[PDB]
Amino acid sequence: ADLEDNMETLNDNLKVIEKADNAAQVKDALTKMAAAAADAWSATPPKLEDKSPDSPEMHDFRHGFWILIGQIHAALHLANEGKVKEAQAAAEQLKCTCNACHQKYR
Amino acid sequence: ADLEDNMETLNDNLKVIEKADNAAQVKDALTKMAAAAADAWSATPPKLEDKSPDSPEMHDFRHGFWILIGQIHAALHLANEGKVKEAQAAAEQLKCTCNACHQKYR
Amino acid sequence: ADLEDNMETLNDNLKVIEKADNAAQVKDALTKMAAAAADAWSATPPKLEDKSPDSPEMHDFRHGFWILIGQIHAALHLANEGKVKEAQAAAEQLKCTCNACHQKYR
Amino acid sequence: ADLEDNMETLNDNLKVIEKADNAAQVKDALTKMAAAAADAWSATPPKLEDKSPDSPEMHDFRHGFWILIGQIHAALHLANEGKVKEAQAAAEQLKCTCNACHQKYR
Ligand code: HEC
Ligand code: HEC
Ligand code: HEC
Ligand code: HEC
Ligand SMILES: [Zn+2]
Numbered sequence: 001a002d003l004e005d006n007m008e009t010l011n012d013n014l015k016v017i018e019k020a021d022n023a024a025q026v027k028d029a030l031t032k033m034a035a036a037a038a039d040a041w042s043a044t045p046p047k048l049e050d051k052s053p054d055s056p057e058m059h060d061f062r063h064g065f066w067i068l069i070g071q072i073h074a075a076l077h078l079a080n081e082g083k084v085k086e087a088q089a090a091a092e093q094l095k096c097t098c099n100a101c102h103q104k105y106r
Numbered sequence: 107a108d109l110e111d112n113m114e115t116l117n118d119n120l121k122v123i124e125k126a127d128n129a130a131q132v133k134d135a136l137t138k139m140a141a142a143a144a145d146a147w148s149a150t151p152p153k154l155e156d157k158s159p160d161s162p163e164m165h166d167f168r169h170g171f172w173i174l175i176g177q178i179h180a181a182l183h184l185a186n187e188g189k190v191k192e193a194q195a196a197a198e199q200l201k202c203t204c205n206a207c208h209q210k211y212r
Numbered sequence: 213a214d215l216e217d218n219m220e221t222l223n224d225n226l227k228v229i230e231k232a233d234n235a236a237q238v239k240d241a242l243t244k245m246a247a248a249a250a251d252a253w254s255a256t257p258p259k260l261e262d263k264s265p266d267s268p269e270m271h272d273f274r275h276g277f278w279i280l281i282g283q284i285h286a287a288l289h290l291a292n293e294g295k296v297k298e299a300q301a302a303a304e305q306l307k308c309t310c311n312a313c314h315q316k317y318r
Numbered sequence: 319a320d321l322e323d324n325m326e327t328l329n330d331n332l333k334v335i336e337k338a339d340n341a342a343q344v345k346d347a348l349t350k351m352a353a354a355a356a357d358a359w360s361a362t363p364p365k366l367e368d369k370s371p372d373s374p375e376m377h378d379f380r381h382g383f384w385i386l387i388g389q390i391h392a393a394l395h396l397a398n399e400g401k402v403k404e405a406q407a408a409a410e411q412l413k414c415t416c417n418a419c420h421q422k423y424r
């Protein structure tokens with residue numbers, strides 16, 4: 001899917017997690033986030049469209065998604081163990097990484 | 107391609123790195139490894155065919171590739187800077203990740 | 213030093229990195245941050261003062277410094293190669309680890 | 319404790335883990351390993367006695383303990399949750415990191 005769609009999927013499911021009531025909702029939303037983040041990993045954002053794929057900017061862009069995926073996986077673990085409140089708190093730590101990338105490449 | 111072909115790629119290019127003389131040959135091998143691991147991401151290993159694609163086991167399986175890809179990209183940095191022996195030490199630690207996943211899922 | 217001093221050292225030197233324009237300044241600040249984080253390793257934060265020093269919580273507390281120390285080292289590596297902007301890009305994500313520990317434990 | 323003593327602690331407690339019957343023995347052993355590795359983190363090994371603490375060798379030596387501690391932390395987490403066989407298996411994957419460091423610096 002394209003980057004815009006990946007971002008709407010991330011945004012939608014992050015807000016679901018914030019408001020969910022059960023592990024199943026949280027796990028389902030985190031699974032969708034993991035897939036959208038892993039898909040966006042290969043994207044070229046408009047700010048960097050003329051940069052080399054080997055460029056430091058793009059390496060930093062891809063690193064941001066690697067970080068985000070690792071955080072999503074950790075939240076998924078917490079949810080698979082039924083620590084819904086801990087998984088929801090982790091989702092709030094996700095936002096910082098979202099914002100870190102946006103503050104640079106949006 | 108499929109997981110088996112992805113793994114042949116990882117194995118072949120790990121051997122290239124070990125015997126390499128120059129940084130470009132290590133960079134080339136690591137780049138192919140990175141591509142193979144990203145393609146293996148979507149795969150269902152035989153030992154997990156009895157699980158749902160969103161099961162804890164399948165997310166842990168993909169987390170192994172997340173680790174591997176992080177390490178591959180660290181070693182690619184070293185190679186891009188001319189540090190052949192340093193990249194070769196990193197590949198020794200890469201094998202620990204190969205083995206750890208194989209211990210659980212191969 | 214104690215945790216209160218270590219956090220001032222982390223915060224002061226993070227601000228130095230944010231305003232730096234040369235690699236020597238960034239390298240100096242990151243080295244001080246690494247020392248402070250290593251020193252903070254042994255600390256017990258007030259909200260875990262009732263927990264055993266090997267509860268899941270205290271190992272998880274130390275793991276937060278383990279993440280930070282890894283990120284500091286990565287940024288230090290970049291500074292040692294003269295890549296100010298790349299080092300400063302890494303300090304921004306560093307901030308999310310500060311925040312994440314504070315969210316759980318401050 | 320000195321580096322040799324740290325290494326005896328690591329080796330003894332790795333064997334305890336392989337021989338354990340319950341999660342509490344595995345947890346106690348990993349706790350001892352986490353502490354000994356964190357002590358060893360700041361040591362200078364005989365092989366690197368004449369090297370700059372800022373040398374690539376010493377950076378790589380310290381990084382090896384950073385890797386090992388992260389692995390120990392992950393195994394301790396598994397044991398704490400009653401994934402006893404997985405914790406024992408992870409401790410068995412520590413050896414690859416031990417050996418990778420020994421190859422270079424012992
Ligand atoms: C880089 C590594 C990013 C991370 C991590 C996250 N996002 Fe993102 N996002 C990024 C870019 C480059 C852009 C701009 C896309 C463009 O075409 O200009 C965006 C955009 C968004 C948007 C707006 C999309 C739109 O249709 O206008 C949203 C809502 C968004 N991003 C959300 C979001 C969330 C919730 C994230 C973490 C969970 C997140 N982003 C991470 C780059 C990066
Ligand atoms: C999990 C995340 C894995 C990682 C990381 C690596 N491998 Fe792997 N490998 C994995 C599976 C599940 C399988 C079985 C595939 C099947 O259909 O049977 C394999 C298989 C291989 C092979 C095939 C030959 C064999 O002895 O089985 C090779 C040559 C191989 N793997 C190599 C390899 C290397 C070098 C890796 C790291 C660089 C590596 N694998 C990582 C799962 C995972
Ligand atoms: C570097 C990053 C290392 C890691 C990780 C591990 N060890 Fe180690 N080990 C290292 C050095 C430099 C030395 C030599 C110390 C000396 O001064 O001679 C060692 C030594 C050992 C020994 C022998 C100790 C002795 O008294 O001679 C053992 C039994 C040993 N190391 C075990 C061990 C284990 C089990 C590890 C991982 C769990 C491990 N070491 C990690 C450097 C490093
Ligand atoms: C846990 C692993 C932490 C990490 C990582 C960081 N900090 Fe922290 N910080 C932590 C705690 C438990 C506390 C509260 C301690 C207390 O006695 O109440 C703090 C506090 C701070 C403060 C406030 C200092 C004060 O005068 O009260 C600052 C300014 C601060 N922390 C900064 C900071 C920075 C910049 C970090 C990353 C670079 C960082 N902290 C990481 C625990 C943890
Ligand atoms: Zn790179």
Ligand SMILES: [Zn+2]
Nearest residue numbers: 077081395399
């Ligand atoms: Zn768990």
Ligand SMILES: [Zn+2]
Nearest residue numbers: 184187289293
């Ligand atoms: Zn470098």
Ligand SMILES: [Zn+2]
Nearest residue numbers: 319320357358
């Ligand atoms: Zn000591």
Ligand SMILES: [Zn+2]
Nearest residue numbers: 285288289377
């Ligand atoms: Zn270094």
